[PDB]
Each structure stands twice: as C-alpha cells, then as structure tokens.
Amino acid sequence: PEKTTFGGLRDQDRIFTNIYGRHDPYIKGAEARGDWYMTKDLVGKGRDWIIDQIKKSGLRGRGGAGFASGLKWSFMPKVSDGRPSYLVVNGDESEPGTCKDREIMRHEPHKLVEGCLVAGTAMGARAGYIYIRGEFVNERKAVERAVAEAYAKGYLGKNACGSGVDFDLFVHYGAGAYICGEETALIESLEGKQGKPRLKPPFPAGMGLYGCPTTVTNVETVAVSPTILRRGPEWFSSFGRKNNAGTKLFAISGHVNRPVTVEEEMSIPLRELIERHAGGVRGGWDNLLAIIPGGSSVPLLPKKMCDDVIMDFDALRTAQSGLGTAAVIVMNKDTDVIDAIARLSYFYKHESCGQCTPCREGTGWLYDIMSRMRKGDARLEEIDMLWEITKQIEGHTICALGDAAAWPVQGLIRHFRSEMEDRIKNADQQ
Amino acid sequence: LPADKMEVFVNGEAVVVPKNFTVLQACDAAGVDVPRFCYHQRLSIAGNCRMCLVEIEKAPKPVASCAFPAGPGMKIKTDTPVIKKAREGVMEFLLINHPLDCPICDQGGECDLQDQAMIFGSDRSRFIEYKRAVADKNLGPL
Amino acid sequence: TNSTDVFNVHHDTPENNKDTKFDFTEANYKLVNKIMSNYPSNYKASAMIPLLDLAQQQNGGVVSLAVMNRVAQILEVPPIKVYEVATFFTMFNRSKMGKYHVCICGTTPCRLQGAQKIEEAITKHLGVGIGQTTADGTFTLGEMECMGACVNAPMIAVADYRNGVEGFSYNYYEDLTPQDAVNILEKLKKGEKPKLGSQHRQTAEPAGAVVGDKWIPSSGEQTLMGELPGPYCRD
Amino acid sequence: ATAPQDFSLAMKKADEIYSGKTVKAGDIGFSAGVPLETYNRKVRIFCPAKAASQSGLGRTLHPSSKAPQWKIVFENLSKWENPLMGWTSTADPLENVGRSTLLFYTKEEAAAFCAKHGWEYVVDEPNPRKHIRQKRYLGYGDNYSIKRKGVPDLAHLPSNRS
Amino acid sequence: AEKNKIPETVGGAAFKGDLRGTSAVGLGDGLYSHTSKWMQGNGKSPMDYINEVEPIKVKGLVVASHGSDDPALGCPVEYISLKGTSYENPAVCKYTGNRYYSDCWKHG
Amino acid sequence: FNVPIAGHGDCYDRYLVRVQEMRESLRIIYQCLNEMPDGLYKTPDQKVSPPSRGQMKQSMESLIHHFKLFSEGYHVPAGETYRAVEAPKGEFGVYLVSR
Amino acid sequence: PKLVYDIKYFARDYRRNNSYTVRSVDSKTPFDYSKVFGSAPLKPADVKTVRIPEVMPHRG
Amino acid sequence: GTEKLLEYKTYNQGIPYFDRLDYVSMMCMEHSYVLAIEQLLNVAVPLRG
Amino acid sequence: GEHALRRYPTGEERCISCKLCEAICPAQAITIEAEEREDGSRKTTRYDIDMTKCIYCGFCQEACPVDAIVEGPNFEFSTETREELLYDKQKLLENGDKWEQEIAANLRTESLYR
Ligand SMILES: Cc1cc2nc3c(=O)[nH]c(=O)nc-3n(C[C@H](O)[C@H](O)[C@H](O)COP(=O)(O)O)c2cc1C
Ligand code: SF4
Ligand code: SF4
Ligand code: SF4
Ligand code: SF4
Ligand code: FES
Ligand code: FES
Ligand SMILES: [Zn+2]
C-alpha cells in the first residue's frame, strides 16, 4: 500500500480466500470463512450508508468499464413510481483472455449471493437475477445450491437476514454469446429476445428489464462490496494509488512458466506480477514479443512498454491500452503475433450480433484483411487501409464490440508494423 | 416557445419544435435532410443502419438522429467534416457486400442506396474480398 | 471446416420436418413449470432459452422444428421469435447430434498453448473432422470460442446427450496434451467417466504449464497456503 | 430552409427587384401566336406527391426543397399503337410540355401564368405531410416500455409465493 | 387453354409455381409465351440453348461468376450461394444463365 | 506560335492569313506530339465521368456510378457561363444557363 | 495513383462547395483612383506584364 | 431547332448536337460546350486529355 | 456501323434488359419492353432500333454493362424501302450471328484501351 511501491499482497488482505477450492465452497465453509457474518446490521444501516461507504472506498467497476461503482449504484431511483427495481449480476464472463469469474462462481458462491443481497438493498431492488454463461453448467449448479441454502436459512426472501428488507434472487443462464455480456444485450437476452444491444440514449437505470429500472454489475464487484462494508473503505483504498484503490483478480495466461489466477493489489508492476506469480515468461523476460494486458479487447503492449508499465487503469490508458479485465496474456519471441491477432479478428467476426452496419460488415472485412496479411498476400498500403477501416468502425456502432474489434488490430499496426512489412515483402521476394 | 414547444439549434439556426421530437425530426423541421435507411415515420425506431449520425456538442461521438431525443439548447451539426467522413464510411460498409445487380435490379432508377451513394459516398472502392451470398426463399405469389 | 449447422434456414429432412411431433415428458413438464415460476406471468417469454435448453437435453441434443413450435405454443408467442432465438445462440444445435459433443476451443490463449495440435490429434484419431459426426455417431466435433478456461488453456468440453435431462453433463477437461485428449476420448468411448477438470492439476493453482506435448511441473510461490483469516467486523 | 447562399440568391434578388406590367387575362395568349384551341384545354395545377419507393423529401414541398415543384399539366388525350411497329402514336401537341418544363415555385405563380395565357385551371393542394410519430412508438425508449405487457407482476416471487 | 391459364414460371432461375412478371405485349395478338412475342420463326430459341447447357460442379459454398472467362469481357462479378444445391436443382447466374451446384455443404 | 497579320483586309489578305494559319497549326501539332504526356486522359472523378468497364465489372460503387451517369447524368450546379473557343471560322461560344 | 485505397470525396468535392457572398455598393463613397493609376507605369522600364497561363488546373 | 432540342436532353446527350452544328469543324464546336460544362461543374482536366 | 445484338458462346443472349441504352440514346431510336422469361431470366420481349433515326454515336454501346449491343463493322446495309430500316430483335440477333467473329476480335482488341 506504500505510495512509493505496490505489490506483495499478504494473505490477510485478500478478499477471495477459497479461490483455489482447498476447502468446502458451500455454506458450512462460507460461514467458517466469515461470510454472512453480520449482514443483518449492514443491511439495516440503510441504502444511503452503503452508497456513501462504497463511494468512499473508491471501488471502480470490474468487467471493462472501470466506472465508479458507487456513482452507478446512486443513479438508481430512490422512490418507486409504480415500477419495481431489479438487480442483474453479469456473470457472463465471455472474454477471450478472462477466466477469473468462473473461479468465483464455483468456489465462492455464497460471497456472490450475499453481495447480491447487499447491493440490491443498496439500490432498492426487490428482485435479483444472476446471469450465468450457458457453458458454465457446473458453476451454475454451485450458484443455485448457494441460493437454495440461503433461502433455507432465511438469508434471502422476505425479512432477509432478519432485517425489514425483502429481496428475492433468481439464477438465469444464457445459451452462449459473447455479446450477451453487454448490459443492454444481456437484458434483451433475459427478456427472451435475441441478445442484441439496445441504443444507450435510453439508459438502463431509467428503463431496463421489463421496462423497469435495472443495474448490471459484474460478479467480482458484487462479491467485493460486502467485505468492503465489513473490512472498511479505508482498508480497500489503501492498497492502490489515487483514484485506483482496490485489489483485483489477475488471471495470468499464455507463455508463462506457471499460468495462475491470483489476487493482487492494483498498481503492481507487470514485470513483478509475471515474475512472482506466473513464474516468469517461458524462456526468461528476454523472450518477450508482446503482452496483451487486459484481455483481447484492449490493444497489446510491446516488450519495451511492458518493461516500465504499471498495472492500473489510468496508466494503461496513458500507454494506449486499458485494464478492461485483469487478463494478461504473454507471448514469446516464438509466437507469431499476426496469427494471434487474426484469430482475435475471427473471434470478433464470430461474436458480432450483426445489428448495426459498421460492426456487422467491418468485422468480417477486418478478418479477411488480417487473413491475407497472415500469409503476406497483401500490399504495403494495405496496412494503411486497415488503419483507416479500424478508424471507420470506431465510434459509429451501437455498442463497444466494434471498438473491441478495432483495438487489437490498431495495436498490431501501431507496435508491430515492422513485422507485417517484413512478412509482406518477403512473400513477394520469395 | 409556448408550453410544450421547445427551442433547438440546427446548424446555428433557431428551430421551435415540441419536446417529444428527436434530433432527426428537428433536423427535418429545420429544412436539413439527413440520410436514412432504417428510419420510418410510421414504424418503430431501430437505429441499426447508423447512417443518420450527426454531431451534438455535449456528446463526444456522433449520435443517431432517429433515436436521439432532442434537448433544450441542443446544437445540432449536420455538415461537420467528421459527419461527412462517417457518412462515407457507413456507405462503404453498406456497399462492400452488396451484389453488383444494378442492371438486373428492379429498383434501378428508384433506389435509395444508389442515390445516397452518389450524394453521400465516395466514387471508388477498396474491397477485393469475397462477398456474401444468400439463397432466396418463396414468400408467396406477390 | 464449418460447424454442425451450415444452414440458417430450415432444411427439410426425414427426421426433421413438419410432421415430426415433440412434447415434454411429465417430469420435464414439471421442470418447465419450475423454470417458468422464476419469471413474471405476463412476461412469460423470459423462459425461452431455459426451455430450449431443456428440450435440447430431452431430444438428444437437437433442436428440431417440432421443438421450436412446441416452445412457441407453450410461451404463447409467434414461432418466428423462437426461430430467431434458436438460430442466434451457438449451443442450440439444429442438426442431428451424436452421443457426445466434443468441442475444442480455438481462441488465442488456447492457440498459443497448443489448441491446434489438440484438434489435429483428435481429428486424426477420430478420423472425421470439425463439424462432422463420427461414422459410428459417437462423437460430433465442434469448434467454439473461449470457454472461460484460459489459465488452463489446452482444453476441451464434452456434453453427454445420451441419457437425457436426467443424465446430461457438460464437463471441462483442461491442461491436456494431445495424448491426454486421446485418452479422454477413449475413456468416453468405453463409457468410463474421466477426471473432471484439469488432468495434471486440481484447479488454477500455481502447479505448472503444458509445454508442447509434455507437462512441465513447476511449483514456486504460493499465496493461500496457511490458515484462512476468517470473520472480522469493524469496531 | 435557412438559405441556399448560391446563385439562387441573385435569382431571388433579380425576382424582387423587377416586376411585370398588369394586362387583362387572356390578352397574352393572343400575342403568343399559338392556335387558339390550345387554350380550350383544361389545366391542373398540382404538386407531385412523394414516390412510395423512396424516402427522399426533395420532390415534396418541404423546407429542404429549393426547386420549383408546382406543375401545369393538361388532360390526357387519345393514344394508339403504330400498326407497323406497335409504337405509341399521339396527336396531342401539349403532351409533355407541362410535365417537363412548366415548373413554378408557388401555386400563385402557376395560377398567374394560367390566367395570363387564358387557360382555365383547377388548383389541387397536396395532402399535408406532418412528421408526427404515434404515441405507442413516440421514441426509441417506448420500444422497451412497460406498455408492451404492463408492469411486471411480482406474484411469482418466492416470498410472495411462500 | 393458354388464354385462361395463369402465367407461370418453369423455375430454372425461379420457383416451380410462382407468378411470371408479364407485360401486356402480345395480349391482343394472342401470343402468351415470352419467345413467341419476339420470334416468329420455328428455329431453336436462346432459352432452348441455355437449357441444353449442363450444370457445372464447383468446390466450396460460393462461386464467383464473371459470365465469360475474362472478367472485363462479360457480366459483372457475381457471388452465388451453393448451399442446398444439387444436379437436379442447381444455382443459376442471373446475368448469364449458367447453372452451378456443389456438394460441400453436405460435408464432402 | 505566331499570329499571322495582314493589313489590307481584302480577300487576298485573308487567303494568305488562312495559309499561314495552316502552317502555325502544323507547328502546334509538332509541339503537341513531342510534349504529349503520359497518364490519365479523362478526369479521375467518377461522379462526372464514367468508370472504366473492368472497374464497373469489379466494383459496386463503379457500377452504381455507371448506372447513374448513363441514366440520369451528372447534376450541374446552378449558374451561367459563356465559354468561347477560337474556332477555324472565328469565335464560337456557348452561353449555358443551369438551374 | 493515391486514390486507389484512400477514398475521400468530401475532401476532393469542388462541385458542391461553391458559394456566393453579398455586398452593398453606394455612390456616396468615392472610388479609389489611387489604386488604379498609382500602380500604373509612367515609363517603359516600369512596365510589368502578366504571363499567359501555361496549363489549366489539373488535380495532379 | 437545335437550341430548343438541347433543353430536352441531358448534358452528355447533347454533345453530338455541337458536332453537327458545324460539319466542317466538329472538334472546335464540341470543345466550347464541354468547356462550359466543365466551368460550371468545376472539373479539372488531366494534362494528357 | 450497323447495330447487332450479341449472344453468349452457349447461345444465350447477353441482353438483360437494363434499359440503359434506351435511356442514353440521344436520338430516342431504341424502344425496349421486357418480361420475366419462363425459366426466370430478365429478357426483352421487344428490342427495336430505328436506323433512320439512329445517329451512330455509339453511346448505346458505351452504356451497355454486358456488351449485348454493339455497332458492328458493316457499312453496306442500304435498303430500297424505309420499312426494312426499322430493325427488330430478331433482325439484330441475326446481324450479331452473322458478324460474331469479327465483332469478338474487335472487342478483344478494344478491351486493352477500354
Ligand atoms: C461486446 C461486449 C461484451 C461484454 N462482455 C462482458 C462480460 O462478459 N462480462 C462483464 O462483466 N462485462 C462485459 N461487458 C461490459 C458490460 O458493459 C458490463 O455489463 C458492464 O460494464 C458491467 O459494469 P460493472 O463494471 O459495474 O460490473 C461487455 C461489453 C461489451 C461491449
Ligand atoms: S457493434 Fe456489433 S455487436 Fe454491437 S450492436 Fe453493432 S453489430 Fe451488434
Ligand atoms: S439498384 Fe439499388 S438495390 Fe438494386 S443492385 Fe443496384 S444498388 Fe443494389
Ligand atoms: S448509336 Fe447512339 S443514336 Fe444509335 S442507337 Fe446507339 S445510342 Fe442511339
Ligand atoms: S442492350 Fe445492353 S444496355 Fe440495352 S437493354 Fe440490353 S443489356 Fe441493357
Ligand atoms: S436512420 Fe438508421 S440509424 Fe437512424
Ligand atoms: S481462450 Fe480457450 S477457454 Fe479461454
Ligand atoms: Zn455470371
């Protein structure tokens, strides 16, 4: 937590404690680990107190947005106009580099349920829905068992936890779509239609599920909120830098000696994280072509930038990338960056719902151009054309999947244009 | 501005419109004609084609006129060069997968796509890849 | 290399056509009622996806035209809505499906750690290819995107469509080298149930990585070792 | 609606500076020198409605439109088929002149032209076009309103059920 | 018979039972066939020519059709869907009338 | 090239002028032949000039432009102009009015 | 040709980008004859000439 | 009636009128017409043309 | 020279009744009316050219997108009555058949330039 240096989080400061499933993930272990401790008091203190404590903690939103959780929760209506309020937890964790949410769902189900209770009381939501990926059948079974147990002991329902508050929780599951993770597209999917995002000028706080005020929040934010109210906002604020306070779950994947999911305070150096928790890059730090810091949506960073880069939101924004999800992917010198970015382009071409013209057409265009560049078929001007097309897509789409499709290609153009030019010229030469 | 009527600025000119209009409705009231493909007066608003994009000083990125509610004191720019570039890009995306069926199309002289390509589009293409192909199905005698 | 469904329109088949009759069994109908109870009565269409999943599990893994028409009738909606939702999502299979549906993730984090060689070994040993059912009908091969198992990158997912709703399981096999994949598929052919989750390690602990065809066991720094902190309250 | 700010500026300014001397109705028709039976033909002064195929508003009377849109048209006369080649034959001298060239900015301009030449005319006003959306789908937000099926009934909640 | 029959399409580039778009040419003379209206002889019609040509097998689910062999000396480039096509029911190029079919969709 | 000039104004003077104009035109042709550049012969803009045939047969935008230029034609902005050329018989000019 | 892969007509659109400004002229304000004849040559040496334009405008 | 016929044709449809105005010198006659249309259209001719 | 409608090497007429050649005709010498053929093709039931109204500009050959209409290399086509100078679809197709090889060679040469 020291302002000069950040890293080396201790076990006493870790929110997610059975993340590795060495203990019983169900209610007996949850109670023995400190779950559902004094939820009666925290809920009874009123929605306003919870909102102010979350605001003071500085908890920004996990899941990619980074928007302050307290302000988003405070956008919820205070008094009913005849429309109930709903809490939907976005447990859809589709992202090519992110695996972190699955461990929370399968090994800490009760922290998530208790957090849903706390947040629904903070926002005055009568009912709650936990959206889960359809592929996560076993994780859904774990969450459903947690919900049933909480209902059995009276933690949920009317007079939940003994306080004069009423909250009902349901578990809903999709059928597989990356787009269904977006806030409006998730609402459309849960209503029963195609998971196509809704234009934002109507906002979900104003009009959401069944036309009623709703808030969509990630499992990780919902899970961390109750312990934030228990441990204290100052404790949560201490770890990170200014405006970037909390600890976050880092999922290291790719060419590392040990791929691990770990919890660490934000503003750790990326080199320190990779070397301590991941065991170092396969073949040493010297053997780095590039690292994708925040899952596939954000632009990649070359080794040189990865040397001094710090694992934070605003700093990665300064480094022309972003910490969407703490899903860091490491590539060796052996790796072909072109093929991986082409696979990401195919991913986005496959995951576009097709609603708006720019995404529906430009993502397939991007995939085709990247496929030709993967073999060297293209010309040297094709790179400039590719940059122009990425600029055409960005900002002109309904949701951010167009931006998430454009960004990796832009990062490839920006940092590894030399390798693309080499591949294009050599194929013509040979 | 009697009661329900508000004031909006379109290209620096004052237009008095009811509060319930959108940006596209006010632009029509101002005499400006916005390119549209999916918007229809008597149908539900969709917002998918993204050809109506205009500029609002408050908003960072271009918004769809058909589905954007107009606000008091809003300034609407339909001729900024960024809007022209966005129009050209949307037109390119519309035309990359369109079949080259103009001579055999019965919409040849009455096509919105051709007219807005001529007016709000570039004169040349950069697409060299395979276009999409669909198999037609019978919808009836008419 | 297209997947099971190549058509976004109804392809008439002797198995799948209008005359085919599908209805929920009484126990499955009770499950239908419990599924619907979660959503408001007036907004009943919210159950479309869970009902389609339940019908897929009952019908052996195929969402037929009769299945879609039955779901549309039960939800009191025009059938085109159910057609659209059954066509949009990936898990909904609208073509005949084998006993097992083996899916290999080909997204980037898996492709770095060797998803290509996993699929190549599986398609050699099985002998059919992606999107094609085995001649016996025991496995149908499919490629899907990231499955949420990126730390355990080389991975496959198998769905048990044999028993039905009572005996359907969607399991993940992780940290697998090609030989491990072949072993899992042979165990599945025998009917023996393999090791759930990753073969070499339990979950995403710091235990090692799959390099090439071998698992390199490296154990360095561990974090959650020791006594867990437990309950605490501010005073 | 603001201003064209082009050659049309000088066109309108030339219009407002100059004027025509008043003459009795029909006197100019004698000066024209055309057959006098031409003025026995009846005139319809109308503005074309929008084609249903296209959504452009240029042809309509809209503030966007800056071109003359009021036509003088004459009634349709006999047409037959050429016996040799099946071509459409006609004897009407005024078949296409009115549609092609007689364009006027305002209805009063066309009425003045007809009265000056002595043509009897009937003016047809276009059906008014008002760009007003219905209350059900007044805005994009109305698509996902509670109006679709009512406020969600909460009698399905486990607390209310139990 | 042809005087009271509904104009119909054989279905090579259309469907077996659809209406045929028809003008009123030849209606007075009593001609009701497309070729009869413009050809008065008893020779072989161009439709007879195009039917005689046989469908061509291609690989893939889409074929590029330029009409002629040289792209700039024929019809505009066209991309035809090969899905749901067989020898008996081939896909057709609208400009040229050439017929195509593929077995790739059947995983072959 | 040099202007041919005579002073009397009679028929003979104009005949001599016309012969010398033929010689000057030959000189101009020789200069054109030697300095003939390489490149485009028509304007690159395809909203006023037809696209080439291979280009229309390969590009959608070029087919649209070809169709709208060979059916409707280009729209000329409102204005008036008088452009004159030194025709062999004198000064030939067109006064074009566009609405 | 740099227009093959770089398409932007609005930057290269000269047809629709012409406009007409407006001024008002009055007889009260005297004409500036200093402009007309102050720059006029008084001797053969001071004569300045305008050369014939060699080519008409082209985009290249 | 050449001048009135021009009014019923499009600009490209009216070029042969100028060729036929003077059968001795065709090119010079059509040249003025194309120059006037180019001035109104603000079109720049390449050097080879 | 003399006009000629052309056929594909299979024997199918190249004309697709786009009607651009009739719209571009400065002299209004082309009258076209079409229909859907029984197979389903877009084909003309009438294509007649007035050769006493034609000015042989070649605009129709420029406007055709499929090279269906071409002005052939034949200038010996004088007639003794004006009725024989009103060509029709059958006559134009016969002229295309008669001069096919020469027209094809000329088009192959011309394709390089345009
Ligand atoms: C295409 C797309 C996919 C997304 N997928 C997810 C996802 O899988 N999980 C998630 O939490 N957010 C996802 N998001 C971000 C959503 O906006 C998310 O519901 C919201 O940011 C959650 O807010 P929070 O930060 O308070 O949790 C996605 C966004 C887009 C545009
Ligand atoms: S950007 Fe892509 S995913 Fe998002 S609404 Fe548009 S088409 Fe759908
Ligand atoms: S006429 Fe319009 S719809 Fe038809 S092919 Fe051409 S651009 Fe497409
Ligand atoms: S050559 Fe010219 S005048 Fe003759 S038919 Fe063709 S377009 Fe018409
Ligand atoms: S000859 Fe050519 S331009 Fe004329 S209708 Fe036939 S295809 Fe169209
Ligand atoms: S008209 Fe299509 S987005 Fe508005
Ligand atoms: S990339 Fe395969 S499970 Fe994440
Ligand atoms: Zn073809």
Touching D (3+ Cβ pairs <8 A), the chains are A, B, C, F, G, I
Contact residues, chain I, for D86 at CB < 8 Å: 46
Choosing among G8, G10, G15, which should be mutated to test the F contact, i.e. which has the most F CBs within 10 A?
Answer: G15
Going by alpha carbons, the residue nearest to atom 1 of ligand 1 is A401
CA atoms of A259 and A281, how far apart (whole Å): 10
- The amino acid present at D59, given as its one-letter code, is R
The answer to whether D146 faces chain C, any CB pair under 8 Å, is no
Q: Coil, strand, or helix at residue E65?
A: strand
The answer to whether B124 faces chain G, any CB pair under 8 Å, is yes
The residues with which B17 forms a beta bridge, in sequence order, are B6
Looking at chain D, list the stretches that DSSP marks H as alpha helix, in order from N- to C-terminal side. 7-17, 27-32, 97-101, 107-117, 158-161
Residue H34 C-alpha from the chain's centroid: 4
Going by alpha carbons, the residue nearest to atom 6 of ligand 5 is I15
The residues with which A60 forms a beta bridge, in sequence order, are A68
Angle between helices A417-429 and A337-351 (to 10 degrees): 110
CA atoms of B87 and A286, how far apart (whole Å): 46
| Pair of tokens at residue D32 | 């024209």
Contact residues, chain C, for D150 at CB < 8 Å: 42
Q: Coil, strand, or helix at residue B55?
A: strand
Query: Would you give the DSSP letter of residue F96?
Result: E
CA atoms of A43 and A40, how far apart (whole Å): 5
* Sequential DSSP letters for C72-98: HHHHTS-HHHHHHHHHHSSS---S---
| Pair of tokens at residue H21 | 């105005």
3-state helix, strand, coil in chain I (%, to 5): 35, 25, 45
Cβ-defined contact of F88 to H45 (cutoff 8 Å):
no
Contact residues, chain I, for E34 at CB < 8 Å: 35-38, 43, 45
| Closest C-alpha to B123, from E94, D64, H48, G15 | G15
First to last CA, chain H: 31
Choosing among G19, G21, G23, G24, which should be mutated to test the D contact, i.e. which has the most D CBs within 10 A?
Answer: G19
Angle between helices A219-231 and A100-107 (to 10 degrees): 60
Looking at chain F, list the stretches that DSSP marks H as alpha helix, in order from N- to C-terminal side. 11-35, 53-58, 60-71
Neighbours of F14 (CB within 10 A): 12
The residues with which A330 forms a beta bridge, in sequence order, are A254, A291
Helix or strand run (H / E) with residue A290: strand A290-292
How many angstroms is the resolution?
2.9
Cα four-point dihedral sign B43, B46, B52, B54? positive
The answer to whether F43 faces chain G, any CB pair under 8 Å, is yes
| Closest C-alpha to C149, from A106, B27, F53 | A106
Residue H47 near residue F93 (C-beta atoms within 8 A): no
Candidate of A102, A182, A323 to mutate for ligand 1, largest count of ligand atoms within 8 Å of Cβ:
A182
| Closest C-alpha to B137, from C11, G22, C187 | C11
Candidate of C118, C119, C145, C156 to mutate for ligand 7, largest count of ligand atoms within 8 Å of Cβ:
C145
Q: Which ligand has the minimum distance to the alpha carbon of residue B116? A: 3
- Answer left, alpha or beta for residue F27, where phi above 0 means left and psi between -120 and 50 means alpha: alpha
Looking at chain B, list the stretches that DSSP marks H as alpha helix, in order from N- to C-terminal side. 23-29, 81-96, 112-120
Residue A33 near residue C228 (C-beta atoms within 8 A): yes
Residue B43 near residue B31 (C-beta atoms within 8 A): no
Residue A135 near residue A176 (C-beta atoms within 8 A): yes
The answer to whether the CB of B52 is under 6 A from ligand 6 is: yes
For residues C182-212, one letter each, b for 16 or more C-beta atoms within 10 angstroms of the residue's C-beta and e for the rest, the string is: bbbbeebeeeeebeebbbbbebbbbbbbbee
| Closest C-alpha to C65, from C127, C21, C122, C5 | C21
Chain D residues contacting A, CB < 8 Å?
140-141, 144-149, 151-152, 154, 157-159, 162
CA dist list (Å): A145 to A15, A37, A139:
22, 19, 10
How many degrees, rounded to 5, is the angle at CA F40 between CA F38 and CA F43? Answer: 150
Residue D8 near residue F78 (C-beta atoms within 8 A): yes
| Closest C-alpha to A251, from A261, A263, A241 | A261
Interface of G with A in 1-60 (CB under 8 A): 4-6
| Closest C-alpha to A71, from A249, A215, A218 | A215
Residue A176 near residue C144 (C-beta atoms within 8 A): yes
| Pair of tokens at residue A228 | 């934030």
| Pair of tokens at residue A390 | 């990425």
Residue I110 near residue I62 (C-beta atoms within 8 A): no
First to last CA, chain B: 49
CA atoms of A269 and A272, how far apart (whole Å): 5
Q: Coil, strand, or helix at residue A253?
A: strand
Helices (H) and strands (E) in chain A, counts: 18, 9
| Pair of tokens at residue E85 | 């096509």
CA atoms of A112 and A106, how far apart (whole Å): 10
- The amino acid present at A336, given as its one-letter code, is D
- Quickly tell me which residue has 């009484």 as its tokens: C26
- Quickly tell me which residue has 């430009």 as its tokens: A362
- The amino acid present at I72, given as its one-letter code, is G
Order of strands, edge to edge, in the sheet holding I30-36?
I30-36, I42-50, I86-87
Query: Would you give the DSSP letter of residue D35?
Result: -
CA atoms of C83 and D90, how far apart (whole Å): 56
Cα four-point dihedral sign C115, C117, C121, C127? positive
What are the sequence ranges of the domains in chain A? 27-241, 337-430
Ligand 6 center–CA B48 separation, angstroms: 6
How many degrees, rounded to 5, is the angle at CA A317 between CA A315 and CA A318? Answer: 65
Question: B99 CB contacts (<8 Å, ≥6 apart)?
Answer: B131, E78, E79, F60
CA atoms of A286 and A415, how far apart (whole Å): 18
Residue H38 near residue G52 (C-beta atoms within 8 A): no
Ligand 3 center–CA E70 separation, angstroms: 24
CA atoms of F16 and C6, how far apart (whole Å): 84
Angle between helices A381-393 and A357-375 (to 10 degrees): 160
Residue D74 near residue B133 (C-beta atoms within 8 A): no
| Closest C-alpha to C191, from C129, C99, C126, C119 | C99
CB-based burial label for E68 (10 Å; 0-12, 13-18, 19+)? middle
Nearest to D152 among C37, C38, C42 (CB): C42
CA atoms of A304 and A288, how far apart (whole Å): 9
The answer to whether the CB of I23 is under 6 A from ligand 4 is: no
Q: Coil, strand, or helix at residue B57?
A: coil
Cβ-defined contact of D140 to B31 (cutoff 8 Å):
no
The answer to whether the CB of C144 is under 6 A from ligand 7 is: no
* Sequential DSSP letters for chain C: ---S---SS----SSSSTT------HHHHHHHHHHHHTS-SSSGGGGHHHHHHHHHHHTTS---HHHHHHHHHHHTS-HHHHHHHHHHSSS---S---SEEEEEE-SHHHHHHTHHHHHHHHHHHH-S-TT-B-TTSSEEEEEES--S--TT-S-EEEEE-SS-STT--EEEEES--HHHHHHHHHHHHHT----SEESSSSSSSSSEEEETTEEEE-----SS-S---------
Alpha-carbon Rg for chain B, nearest whole angstrom, is 18
Nearest to D152 among A166, A199, A212 (CB): A212
I2: phi then psi, degrees, rounded to nearest 5: -65, 135
CA atoms of D56 and D47, how far apart (whole Å): 15
CA atoms of C40 and E108, how far apart (whole Å): 48
Q: What is the number of alpha carbons within 13 Å of residue C165 lying toward its C-beta?
A: 18
The answer to whether the CB of B64 is under 6 A from ligand 6 is: yes
Residue F30 C-alpha from the chain's centroid: 19
| Closest C-alpha to E104, from C92, C16, C131 | C131
Neighbours of D95 (CB within 10 A): 14
Cβ-defined contact of E77 to F58 (cutoff 8 Å):
yes
CA atoms of A323 and D38, how far apart (whole Å): 81
Ligand 1 center–CA D161 separation, angstroms: 33
H25: phi then psi, degrees, rounded to nearest 5: -120, 90
Neighbours of B24 (CB within 10 A): 26
Cβ-defined contact of I16 to B104 (cutoff 8 Å):
yes
Question: A330 CB contacts (<8 Å, ≥6 apart)?
Answer: A252, A253, A254, A255, A256, A274, A278, A281, A282, A288, A291
CA atoms of C208 and C220, how far apart (whole Å): 9
CA atoms of I90 and D151, how far apart (whole Å): 71
Cα four-point dihedral sign F65, F66, F67, F71? positive
* Nearest residue of chain F to residue E70 (CA atoms): F54
CA atoms of G37 and D141, how far apart (whole Å): 71
Q: Which ligand has the minimum distance to the alpha carbon of residue I44? A: 5
Residue C225 near residue A298 (C-beta atoms within 8 A): no
Residue A71 C-alpha from the chain's centroid: 18
Residue E97 near residue I41 (C-beta atoms within 8 A): yes
Cβ-defined contact of I31 to D84 (cutoff 8 Å):
no
Experimental technique, in short, is cryo-EM
CA atoms of I34 and I47, how far apart (whole Å): 9
CB-based burial label for C224 (10 Å; 0-12, 13-18, 19+)? middle
Ligand 3 center–CA F60 separation, angstroms: 9
- Answer left, alpha or beta for residue E10, where phi above 0 means left and psi between -120 and 50 means alpha: alpha
Cα four-point dihedral sign E50, E52, E54, E55? positive
Q: Coil, strand, or helix at residue A427?
A: helix
Residue A419 near residue A337 (C-beta atoms within 8 A): yes
Q: How near does any CA of chain C get to the CA of D5, in Å?
A: 51
- The amino acid present at F76, given as its one-letter code, is V
CA dist list (Å): C155 to A249, A322, C175, E50:
22, 27, 6, 54
The answer to whether C120 faces chain A, any CB pair under 8 Å, is no
- The amino acid present at D53, given as its one-letter code, is S
Residue A109 near residue A238 (C-beta atoms within 8 A): no
CA atoms of E20 and E23, how far apart (whole Å): 10
Question: G9 CB contacts (<8 Å, ≥6 apart)?
Answer: B88, B121, B122, B123, F47
Q: Coil, strand, or helix at residue I86?
A: strand
CA atoms of E3 and F22, how far apart (whole Å): 72
Question: E71 CB contacts (<8 Å, ≥6 apart)?
Answer: E77, F54, F57, F58
How many degrees, rounded to 5, is the angle at CA A327 between CA A321 and CA A332? Answer: 80
The answer to whether I16 faces chain F, any CB pair under 8 Å, is no
Looking at D18-61, list the stretches that DSSP marks H as alpha helix, in order from N- to C-terminal side. 27-32
| Closest C-alpha to B23, from B4, B37, B9 | B9
| Closest C-alpha to A84, from A216, A186, A207 | A207
- The amino acid present at F81, given as its one-letter code, is T
- The amino acid present at A110, given as its one-letter code, is H
CA atoms of A191 and D144, how far apart (whole Å): 10
